[PDB]
Paper text:
Aspartate transcarbamoylase (E.C.2.1.3.2, aspartate carbamoyltransferase, ATCase) catalyzes the second step of the de novo biosynthesis of pyrimidines in most of organisms, which is the carbamoylation reaction between carbamoyl phosphate (CP) and L-aspartate (Asp), generating N-carbamoyl-L-aspartate (CA) and a single phosphate group (Pi). E. coli ATCase holoenzyme is a dodecamer composed of two catalytic trimers and three regulatory dimers. Under physiological conditions, E. coli ATCase can adopt two states at quaternary level: a low activity and affinity T (tense) state and a high activity and affinity R (relax) state, where an equilibrium exists between the T and R state. The catalytic chain of ATCase can be divided into two domains: the CP domain and the Asp domain, and it is the closure of the two domains that trigger the T to R state transition of ATCase.
Residue numbers in the entry:
A (entry chain B), B (entry chain B): 11 to 47, 57 to 153
C (entry chain A), D (entry chain A), E (entry chain A), F (entry chain A): 1 to 75, 85 to 309
Write the structure that this text describes.
Amino acid sequence: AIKRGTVIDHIPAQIGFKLLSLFKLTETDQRITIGLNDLIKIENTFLSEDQVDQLALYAPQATVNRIDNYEVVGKSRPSLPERIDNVLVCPNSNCISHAEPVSSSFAVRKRANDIALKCKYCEKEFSHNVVLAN
Amino acid sequence: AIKRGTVIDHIPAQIGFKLLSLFKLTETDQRITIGLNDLIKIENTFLSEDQVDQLALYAPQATVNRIDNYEVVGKSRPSLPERIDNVLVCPNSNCISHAEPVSSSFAVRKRANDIALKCKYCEKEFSHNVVLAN
Amino acid sequence: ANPLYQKHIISINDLSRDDLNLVLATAAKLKANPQPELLKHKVIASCFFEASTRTRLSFETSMHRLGASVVGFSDGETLADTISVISTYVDAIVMRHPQEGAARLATEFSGNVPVLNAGDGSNQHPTQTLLDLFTIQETQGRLDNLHVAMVGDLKYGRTVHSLTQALAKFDGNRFYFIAPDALAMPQYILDMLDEKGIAWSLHSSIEEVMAEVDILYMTRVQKERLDPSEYANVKAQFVLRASDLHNAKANMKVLHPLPRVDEIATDVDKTPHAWYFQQAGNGIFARQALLALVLNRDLV
Amino acid sequence: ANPLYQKHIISINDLSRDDLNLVLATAAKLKANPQPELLKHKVIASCFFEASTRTRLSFETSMHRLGASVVGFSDGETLADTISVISTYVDAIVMRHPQEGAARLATEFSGNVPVLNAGDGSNQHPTQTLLDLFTIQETQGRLDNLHVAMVGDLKYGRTVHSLTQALAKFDGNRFYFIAPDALAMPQYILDMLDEKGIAWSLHSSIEEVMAEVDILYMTRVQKERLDPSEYANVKAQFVLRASDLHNAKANMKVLHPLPRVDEIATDVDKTPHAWYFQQAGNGIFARQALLALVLNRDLV
Amino acid sequence: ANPLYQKHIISINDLSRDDLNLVLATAAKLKANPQPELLKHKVIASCFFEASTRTRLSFETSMHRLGASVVGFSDGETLADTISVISTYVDAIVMRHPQEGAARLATEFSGNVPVLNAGDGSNQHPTQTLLDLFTIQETQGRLDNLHVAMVGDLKYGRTVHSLTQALAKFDGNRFYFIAPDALAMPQYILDMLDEKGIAWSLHSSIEEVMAEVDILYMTRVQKERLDPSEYANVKAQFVLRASDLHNAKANMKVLHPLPRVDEIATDVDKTPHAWYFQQAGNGIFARQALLALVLNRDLV
Amino acid sequence: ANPLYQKHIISINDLSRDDLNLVLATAAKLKANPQPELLKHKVIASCFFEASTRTRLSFETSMHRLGASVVGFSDGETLADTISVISTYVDAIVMRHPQEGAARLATEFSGNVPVLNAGDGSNQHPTQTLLDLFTIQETQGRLDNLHVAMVGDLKYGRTVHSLTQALAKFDGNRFYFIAPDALAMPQYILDMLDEKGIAWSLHSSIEEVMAEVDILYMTRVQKERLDPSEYANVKAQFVLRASDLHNAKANMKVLHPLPRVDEIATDVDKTPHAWYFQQAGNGIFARQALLALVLNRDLV
Ligand SMILES: [Zn+2]
Ligand SMILES: [Zn+2]
């Protein structure tokens, strides 16, 4: 469909809109095609695999193709990053991060049934089920 | 493109994503096609002209077609509603609406260069430029 | 059932002209012939989330003068939940709150239990306007074709905003606004008077208009609102002494929602024009009338 | 004279099964047919040594609904001397106090004047248990052979300790305890249930047992009790949303002694299962029944 | 001895143009070459009758950077007696007080001990103006022929009143005043500028004049000063974001006496125009210069 | 420059084993040969956003023992802005704050100015662990192959969490945990010890292990953490008297971060095992060592 750019496919239901909001992908000025029930198409923008990895917590089974000159010049997939910044909120109500001009930041640790997310500031560790719930 | 449903066209730049978030249109389960740089396509859902009127403050010059059996069975456009609920936030920091399980609600009053929005609770009136700024 | 039976009393702007006259007529009838058992077996909640001893004593005396029982408090849980609970207890809720719109919110969780706004932040205080109107009607014989002067902090005095809007529902009234430029009557009030063709004018001192005035409504000029020195240089424009009343009309009354600090000197108290304490006593009958109309089907 | 005439009401553990049914029957009768003059000419002291606006408004409304007069206070001299003095004034003492055993001590200095415990520290709060029992009986039609789930801070919730012990005086009840390991039901309660052959079980989430539950009793989980971060990692186990009720029995009721913070989301309020505000309204009749039985010889 | 040796520093209005340049030259010299032992064996009293942690830390750091010892307090006896006692202890008094004129009064009881005004109510705060002047001179290379915009609460900002009067002692400066009508620059300041033939103009928003501005002086607009809703309708006129600086001169600096709430968005902090934290750091050298000139005969 | 020159000291978890030995060696050298002028002409900010007199006096004495000047405060504006300002004043920031992570946030706005964490909520307090380690090394001659018992509130004692993790960086240590079940050592600590093959065991009383213990680390068991009656039934398990030390090793030391209430009876004070006051005195040298290493290029 699109000329040069990037595509994100096989996003679970009720996650494509989340990816658009949480990663501010519609804060560009060139074309974007989106289909829900989800898939997202952008033209002419870099996506480091750091940024594709940031989709792992939300759309783990998904793919990203770097497209140039109408051609598939790559097909990368997300795998768990070491750090997740900006998008998560620390569930510790006494954490300094809440009232202050800083970016949230969590260390990522895979577990048996869980992802362990450790806040950079309060140094408390939480389940990813707890962090993504509020 | 779509079978039966509704379409919203000629949305200003940087407003289609706003309409999706503010009116929770992607909280359905049937098809949605979106193009940015904006236009939005939904299948099989009512849209009262109350709800189309709620797009006036954001996408004043736009249209809405009720589509059934692949046919254009209407073409309504938004004009300013009397009331705007749920989506706006009262700029009065001492308003009771802020900490409480109630829906925001404002009366709408057209002015020379302005929309006057009067909160249902605190009964204070503000410019629409002030309300939409925070 | 009377037109105000089981109605919420939240804002003066919600009260039609017929509503105003209904309250005022009931207040006059209860003053002439008290009904100390009209509200026997009723329990009323006196909810002063924001403390106001002067307002509470007046409201609670009104409840007792009609025979009702009173539970209440002065000064976490959402206001919605508090009303959800209290409205299972009582027959009516009288509430004062620091947040604007709190009384309106209470009506959406009180079920069948009526809510009477005793003051919600800087928004509404309907029974103060009603007792002001009742006092003007009682002393002047009418609410139309009056010359009303209003002095002091007109910018932040929500009490004069409400009284102006209420008096604007009657015909032929003429207003005089005497305020410092930093505390002038807001433009939205002046616009409202222009839309209705109501005459008004600004004056820098009371002596300009003293000879024509039927009602002199004095207000609190809190020192907060200006500098302590900004106050002193303008305050003479807006303080009243007995010698200022030398050419006043025989029927003129000085009103003040109280408390006064020094905007009204004590030598005014003994003149026949002083009516702020009588005005305060009229709050009993205006608040009685509201409780009677809201909680009793048939008129007094 | 009825079995509770002129008796002190200090602890649920002092109330026999016949006592419980007597209070509950009187509460139902006063709800169906109010007696607004039953306690006319009685004066009751509302002594809140520890302030509790929500408890006091409920108790004082109960007094007024029976026609009694109320004197009292909220917030040196020994408690014994205070009771020695007040018991010469009034016909009954309703008291809330920060120290455990304060109500029991008051009975030893009040003479013939009955004492009603409105809460003594972390010990007893009998009228909360009585209104809980009355609400369960009213919604379920009985107090026996029920499936009762209790969620939250079971370790420090003296409210569930008392309700468990009261419900254990009726037959065939089955309990579900859903609490974090740090706030589990204390062993002395589990021992009591074992001695009586009463079935109980632990569950880490409400969804395990939702299908069988007749009463879902939610409790306050104050953030004090754990770390602020310890809270967040366990709190999902013990918060209720409307979607959690998809397979609930038609007759199930959600109860909560209040106030709630966020253990019950507001979207539960509109479901037919939400009954915590009706539960609070039932405190009027349970507390009326206590005052009526204690101060009036003949049954209602 | 330098012209300011053993002089009191009470009001900017007492400082001649030569005085201003003397302080600013000394501040630059102490910044370039610190003298950490200049005031060894001096003891200075840091008397904050009105607490101000941000002012005190700056002043006390200045004292220590010159090697002086510091005794003091933050928060009955007359102020005259307090100074009569303390001036027997110390070599200089730095004082902040809630009453206007307190520093001037102290000079009449301190004997030979100099008094430095760290703020006396709504009157004077000379070292804030001196650090502002020093920052403008450092970033612009001069204090004459500048375009200075001042934004926010100009009516009650005694900080802009003082800076305007100080800058009016230099030639060719042009001023832009951006304030809401209720918080406009007072007329006595405008009169002063007219008497000296100094050009000034009013503007309702910063974008009108952004292209010409050398110094953008932002001020605190406390919510106290207006209604909470009056605030919101005008506040956009007087808040600064990074996108507002798109056509700013390369040399322009944004100043703010601090603390900021939201008049300056945090995205301004990273632009080369943000200079309010550098401005705060310059208070050390302006206050060092004052202590050095007052307590040391020979110039730095 | 030494490995810690101009480094922030935020968390013990950030300190390598070489870092720990560097601090401890410097502390021993400064104790043996004080350097009262090492930090002359340095100005250090003592920022106690959360007051702690016992911590502040120790830190400020350390600063003065090295010759540094001290400005500070005990007890709106964002913390980021406060640090943005203060870091233009001083050469280092020592800060205690009620919010977790506050010291880490300060490092992102302090520029080149190092931040030393004196306690950030329930997170980190590195100098308490460092003085504990220094005291253990001084009395036992090493930090490896020790038998360390830790008694009291192990669940909420962040002081024992940090000391355990620090001691786990040395070999052959064996731990004894003596705590009530409600205040046990958290599982994440036990997991950490298991991953490293470090031996540990639980014990319900100190007498089980007294004969083998090299260090007995007693902690505060605040009454907040349990019921007032829950306290009394378990508190004997975790209180120390002199008679408990009858079979203690000659080299054993009793440690306590202080203040003690009654977990250590006063008759322990006179035994050679009592070392909590010597431990407190060692905080001077551990905090001196940190300031010396951070602010001085060359090692002591
Ligand atoms: Zn955190
Ligand atoms: Zn509002």
